[PDB]
Design a protein around this ligand. Structure first.
Ligand SMILES: [Mg+2]
Ligand SMILES: [Zn+2]
Ligand SMILES: [Zn+2]
Ligand SMILES: [Zn+2]
Lengths: 43, 243, 67, 350, 45, 335, 102, 39, 48, 49
């Protein structure tokens, strides 16, 4: 009961700006430690 | 958010929700707005409420649990060795939900030679206040670091520290309340469990009865970082001098 | 400027604590600390004003064009 | 450029989270961090190129009643007094110019000075202030220059920045009455309490030496050193602290305020030179109502000066799109901003 | 009216409605204003 | 638990008083009003005019915190608030000078006055016991004399350093009745308020009020009303030999002493020292001399602002706590 | 005089018969919080009494006295508050009878 | 300028408080205009 | 909850059309006045 | 300099992905009633919860 109730609820509810959520998700991690140590000369 | 009318014209929000705003309290201004019609007010509070937004959508972990004093004071409450007096446990249990709701005092962990409640039972009382609240949960997790159980033992609880935690029936039986057990980490905290088990309201209520607990107790316990605290010993000095 | 009448953290009065300090530093000289010990200072947050506090009001009252 | 205060480094009352100080009532009440903000308002009265002069006469008595709320603090001279107060509406300096001289007629014998309408400048401010120095003078071109500055004695309120000189900032969180802060055997209640969490990740250990050096400087009498790469060391400093009778590390046992028993861990406390910044909460508070709008877009102005306006968009309106709010994002960009009545048509609907 | 304190020798002079403002024997140009004779009131807080 | 805490080099032990019935299997004795009266005898050291060192017994830290909390703030005092001015041409602005006039103590005993309301304005605020008015006026010129004084301005200018004794007292009607048997002065007459120059003038009229310490800082009659847990030395395995010299040079030269020759180190008295705990550093005394801070004693050190004796202060604190509890006892319960 | 301002029983925290009651008392602070908690707590009938202010800028204090089935928590505060007056009367009497010496 | 609804030709006063400063009439209280527009 | 202080809460309004349920509460906030915090600044009746 | 570049990167990432709904056919759709993926993530489930 609990696993199926958590699976049917976890289905994406329609009418949601998934592109906006994804674009806020990709643009968020602006930490970017950029460890340039060591495969040589790769960005 | 909702409104609240207090003096001393600077703003107050809370400190558990400081992580998404990334505030630093260093002269950082941060403006507010109000809706106007009756449509957009409910459109704000039912779709953008703080009880609904316990998750950042980038991976689905809880992001609003607590902050530095709350975690480091709950660690001092429930370390392994903070046996409370009945007066001290009484005051500390009343000073979380001040007078709005009651508690049922469990039998202590130690009988007739002096009755002392272990701090983990004290954190267990924080989750389940009464039998009228259906808040029974289950959890098993890890306190962000542990020395592994060096012998041939199947559980990870038989270590030099508490290590692996376990919750059976809204009761912690081993462990502390550090990071990635309380929040701001992976998806196995206590508040995430209260959320997924019994909705947003009890998840918010557990945080707002932990905040008034730990903020009011850590000012009473005491914690400082002196020059003796950051003193290198002579052994470290003579080891560095040769290494 | 002018020394406050009572110290900030504690509440001991700081009147008859400044002129009796400069009078004791000019005449009947003591080093720095036996002055306060003989004047009657015990708590060391009552001692962070007489030891501290350059006198600014004696430099502010200099500017009076024949008042 | 500051003020000295003893300070107990502990985590107290939960108002000590992230550079969140906590001050002391009846210690801040004794003149701790008191401010004086001075702004001048110079309105040079000029005579025009139309044979006129701006008379600054005022003093409408209105039936001998110590006159009205507009012209109360102005006196029978035109210029404001010294020492009288003003709270958001009293005229403290008068400026009356004519409007027939706004154009350029001939200097006829008709009445040019026939009206002396009132257009002064008024102290628009949230809090009352005083006048301490008003002067009338002359400029280069023989006209009556008037400069007046106003000062108010700002008590340091809650929301005000207080930063150490050693490198940690801070805004006060709450004010404690007198005795809820932990005292000692001598009974000295500290003034401020800093965050213990502000020390590790900001990586400051010289403040932890600064408390000891300040304690020995206020103890032994001598103003102590602490310059770069030299100064007074710690080895003799701990010897002085243990020779007077205090602890060798600056620590002390303290007694809790709300319960009276001891503290389980030791708390060290000593003086730090604490300077106050130019971020009084009265100088940074902002408001908005249905007020002034621009002549160009019929939207409010910028900053705080004119009236004010706090924009949202270009990264901020996209947040409620990411939530999925439809009617809030419609209302707070259409109805609350500007509701206009463009007429349209079907055939060539311009 | 006894006001308009000077800024060089502090003389109490009373200029008329047309003066093209000037001081007394000090030979100065600017002048301050004396304190009013009223009763200002406030608490000691 | 023997009423004593532990002192380790990093934390203390057994902070809670834990002396209630319901702690281990029985009645760890209950209240028993005859027993608390039988087992309560205090020890007074001395009473000066600005010092008291009277001790206490057989009570926990809670009501001792109550008696030091009400003593520092919740007992009334007397000081001026409303300072009316008259053409103050000094360099000090009137707010700071009136703050200095208010915050200085005023030596006059209370219960000669009553409390004031926030309503009934200025013509009815001061109703027959509210006002200790202190009128002041001071100004100087260049002193006609021939001193030299080329560095110090002492003999050059008249009364340039005004003091607290310049604040006079104006009685009117019934105000002279309480002045005849009780002449009013400030606390210390040598308190510097302002510094003036010739051409500048200070004249004012300050009104007084009866207030409690929660409002302002000048309404606190005690500078420091704290207490002290008495340090109990619990030295065992005596240290006779040449180690007693280092044991004396490590501790203060007070609380501990040595008999003669190669004897052990005894303890002189109890109320002498704080805890320096330098013995918890060396590897000779770290497991040999064990100290602690006993409860049950609560060494007081109070001092007056000049208003009243501390034996009146402690008595007034006890009486106002009893009145504050009685006002809550006689209150009816209404939901 | 019907001066109901100080004490007020919470209608949304008590039980049916009694045995537990939140007392919202006004105009009081930590001056008597631990001074009354210590006296009510050493009552062998009272098993859980603790005080906590809601917010320091408000002059409020909530205390929740839980007890067993013997006595009412309303009337338990009466006996646990008379005894603090008895404490202060004993301390005042001994201080008066001792201060007459020297 | 004398445009109003309940009265006619009265005086006016822009507000000093609440940062609102609209040009309002007297003795009944009607704004009788739009929001203020300044440059 | 964000604590909104009354120095910026008395200048920050919210419209409430009366709906025969809050008539007593809105009458209380009209008779109380806009100077104290539980009050109302402006009003607009049915007529234009 | 890294935050100065990252702000403009997150802003110019937005307008190409701002209008992207998810209709009741369990599909994700663009502004012109087009389609880019027939079920979201292959499963159709919420990546938040
Ligand atoms: Mg910042
Ligand atoms: Zn001091
Ligand atoms: Zn001159
Ligand atoms: Zn009208």
């Amino acid at each position: 009961e609990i696993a199926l109730f958590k699976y049917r609820k976890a289905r994406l509810e329609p009418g949601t700006a998934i592109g906006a959520i994804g674009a806020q998700s990709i643009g968020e991690p602006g930490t970017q430690m950029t460890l340039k140590t060591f495969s040589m000369n790769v960005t | 958010h909702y409104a609240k009318i207090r003096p001393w014209r600077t703003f107050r929000l809370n400190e558990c929700v400081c992580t998404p705003y990334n505030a630093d309290f260093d002269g950082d201004e941060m403006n507010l707005h109000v809706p106007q019609t009756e449509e957009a007010r409910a459109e704000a509070i039912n779709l953008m409420g703080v009880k609904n937004n316990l998750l950042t959508p980038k991976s689905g972990e809880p992001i609003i649990a607590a902050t530095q004093d709350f975690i480091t004071g709950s660690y001092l409450i429930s370390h392994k060795d903070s046996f409370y007096d009945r007066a001290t446990l009484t005051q500390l249990l009343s000073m979380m939900s001040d007078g709005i709701e009651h508690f049922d005092i469990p039998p202590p962990a130690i009988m007739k030679p002096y009755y002392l409640w272990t701090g983990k039972q004290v954190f267990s009382l924080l989750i389940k206040p009464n039998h009228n609240s259906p808040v029974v949960i289950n959890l098993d997790a890890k306190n962000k670091v542990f020395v592994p159980p060096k012998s041939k033992s199947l559980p990870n609880e038989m270590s030099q520290n508490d290590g692996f935690v376990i919750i059976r029936g809204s009761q912690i039986l081993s462990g502390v309340m550090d990071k990635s057990v309380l929040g701001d980490g992976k998806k196995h905290s206590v508040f995430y469990t209260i959320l997924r088990d019994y909705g947003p309201q009890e998840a918010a209520n557990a945080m707002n009865r932990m905040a008034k607990l730990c903020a009011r107790f850590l000012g009473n316990r005491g914690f400082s970082i002196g020059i003796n605290d950051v003193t290198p010993a002579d052994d470290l000095k003579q080891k560095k001098e040769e290494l | 400027m002018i020394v406050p009448v009572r110290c900030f953290s504690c509440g001991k009065v700081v009147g008859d604590k400044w002129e009796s300090y400069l009078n004791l530093l000019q005449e009947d000289e003591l080093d720095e600390g036996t002055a306060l010990s003989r004047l009657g200072l015990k708590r060391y947050c009552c001692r962070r004003m007489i030891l501290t506090h350059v006198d600014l009001i004696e430099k502010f009252l200099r500017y009076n064009p024949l008042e | 450029a500051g003020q000295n205060a003893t300070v107990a480094v502990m985590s107290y009352s939960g108002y000590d989270i992230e550079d969140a100080l906590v001050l002391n009532k009846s210690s801040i009440d004794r003149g701790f961090g008191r401010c004086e903000t001075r702004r001048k308002t110079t309105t040079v009265l000029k005579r025009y190129a139309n044979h006129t002069q701006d008379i600054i006469g005022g003093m409408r008595v209105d039936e001998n009643g110590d006159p009205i709320w507009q012209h109360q603090s102005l006196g029978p001279d035109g210029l404001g007094e010294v020492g009288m107060k003003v709270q958001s509406g009293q005229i403290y300096i008068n400026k009356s110019v004519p409007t027939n001289s706004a154009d350029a007629p001939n200097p006829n014998n008709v009445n040019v000075q026939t009206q002396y309408r009132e257009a002064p400048v008024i102290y628009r401010g949230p809090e009352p202030s005083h006048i301490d120095q008003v002067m009338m003078s002359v400029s280069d071109n023989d006209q009556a220059l008037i400069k007046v500055l106003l000062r108010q004695n700002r008590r340091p309120e809650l929301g005000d920045k207080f930063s150490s000189r050693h490198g940690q900032k801070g805004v006060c969180g709450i004010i404690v009455k007198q005795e809820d802060m932990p005292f000692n055997d001598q009974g000295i209640v500290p003034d401020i309490i800093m965050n213990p969490h502000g020390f590790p990740s900001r990586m400051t250990v010289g403040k932890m030496i600064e408390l000891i050096s300040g304690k020995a400087g206020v103890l032994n009498g001598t103003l102590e050193y602490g310059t770069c790469f030299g100064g007074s060391k710690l080895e003799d400093m701990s010897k002085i602290l243990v020779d007077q009778g205090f602890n060798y590390s600056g620590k002390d046992m303290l007694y809790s305020g709300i319960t009276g028993e001891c503290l389980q861990a030791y708390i060290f406390f000593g003086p730090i030179y604490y300077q106050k910044l130019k971020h009084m909460v009265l100088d940074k508070m902002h408001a908005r109502a249905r007020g002034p709008r621009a002549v160009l877009t019929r939207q409010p102005t910028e900053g705080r000066s004119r009236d004010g306006g706090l924009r949202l968009g270009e990264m901020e309106r996209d947040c409620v799109i990411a939530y999925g709010a439809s009617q809030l994002l419609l209302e707070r960009l259409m109805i609350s901003s500007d509701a206009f009545e463009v007429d349209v048509c079907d055939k060539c609907g311009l | 009216t006894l006001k308009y304190i000077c800024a060089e020798c502090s003389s109490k002079l009373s200029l008329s409605r047309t003066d093209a403002v000037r001081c007394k024997d000090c030979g100065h140009r600017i002048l301050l204003k004396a304190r009013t004779k009223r009763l200002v009131q406030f608490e000691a807080r | 638990m023997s009423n004593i805490v532990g002192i380790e080099y990093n934390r203390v032990t057994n902070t809670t008083s834990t002396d209630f019935p319901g702690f281990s299997k029985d009645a760890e004795n209950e209240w028993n009003v005859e027993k608390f009266k039988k087992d309560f005898e205090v020890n007074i050291s001395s009473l000066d005019a600005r010092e008291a060192n009277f001790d206490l017994i057989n009570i926990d830290t809670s009501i001792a915190n109550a008696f030091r909390r009400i003593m520092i703030s919740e007992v009334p005092s007397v000081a001026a608030e409303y300072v009316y001015f008259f053409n103050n041409t000094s360099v000090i602005q009137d707010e700071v000078l009136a703050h200095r006039i208010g915050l200085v103590p005023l030596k006059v005993d209370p219960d000669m006055l009553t409390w004031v309301d926030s309503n009934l304005p200025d013509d009815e605020k001061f109703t027959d016991e509210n006002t200790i008015v202190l009128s002041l006026n001071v100004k100087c010129t260049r002193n006609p004399d021939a001193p030299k004084g080329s560095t110090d301005p002492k003999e050059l200018y008249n009364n340039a350093h005004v003091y607290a004794r310049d604040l006079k007292f104006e009685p009117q009607g019934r105000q002279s009745t309480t002045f005849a048997d009780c002449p009013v002065v400030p606390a210390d007459p040598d308190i510097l308020l302002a510094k003036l120059r010739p051409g500048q003038e200070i004249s004012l009229k300050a009104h007084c009020i009866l207030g409690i310490g929660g409002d302002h800082a000048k309404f606190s009659p005690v500078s420091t009303a704290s207490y002290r847990l008495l340090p109990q030395i619990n030295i065992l395995q005596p240290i006779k030999g040449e180690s007693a010299r280092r044991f004396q040079k490590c501790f203060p030269p007070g609380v501990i002493g040595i008999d003669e020759g190669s004897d052990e180190a005894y303890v002189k008295d109890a109320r002498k020292d704080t805890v320096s705990r330098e013995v918890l550093r060396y590897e000779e005394f770290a497991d040999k001399v064990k100290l602690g801070r006993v409860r049950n004693h609560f060494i007081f050190n109070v001092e007056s602002a000049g208003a009243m004796t501390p034996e009146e202060i402690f008595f007034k604190s006890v009486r106002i706590l009893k009145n504050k509890a009685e006002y809550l006892k006689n209150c009816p319960i209404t939901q | 005089e019907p001066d109901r301002e100080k004490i007020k029983l919470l209608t949304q925290a008590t039980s049916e018969d009694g045995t537990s009651a939140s007392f919202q008392i006004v105009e009081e602070d930590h001056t008597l919080g631990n001074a009354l908690r210590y006296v009510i707590m050493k009552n062998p009938d009272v098993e859980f009494c603790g005080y906590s202010i809601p917010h320091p800028s408000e002059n409020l204090l909530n205390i929740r006295i839980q007890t067993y089935g013997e006595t009412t928590a309303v009337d338990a505060l009466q006996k646990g508050l008379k005894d603090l007056m008895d404490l202060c009367d004993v301390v005042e009497s001994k201080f008066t009878e001792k201060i007459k010496s020297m | 300028m004398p445009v109003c609804k309940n009265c006619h030709g009265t005086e006016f006063e822009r507000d000093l408080s609440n940062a609102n400063n609209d040009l309002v009439c007297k003795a009944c209280g009607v704004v009788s205009e739009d929001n203020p527009i300044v440059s | 909850e964000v604590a909104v202080p009354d120095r910026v809460a008395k200048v920050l309004t919210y419209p409430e059309k009366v709906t025969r349920y809050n008539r007593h509460k809105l009458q209380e906030l009209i008779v109380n006045g806009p100077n104290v915090h539980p009050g109302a600044n402006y009003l607009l009746k049915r007529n234009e | 300099v890294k935050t100065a570049e990252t702000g403009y990167m997150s802003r110019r990432l937005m307008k190409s992905l701002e209008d992207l709904s998810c209709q009741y056919d369990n599909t994700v759709r663009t502004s012109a009633n087009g389609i880019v993926q027939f079920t979201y993530g292959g499963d159709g489930l919420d990546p938040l919860e």
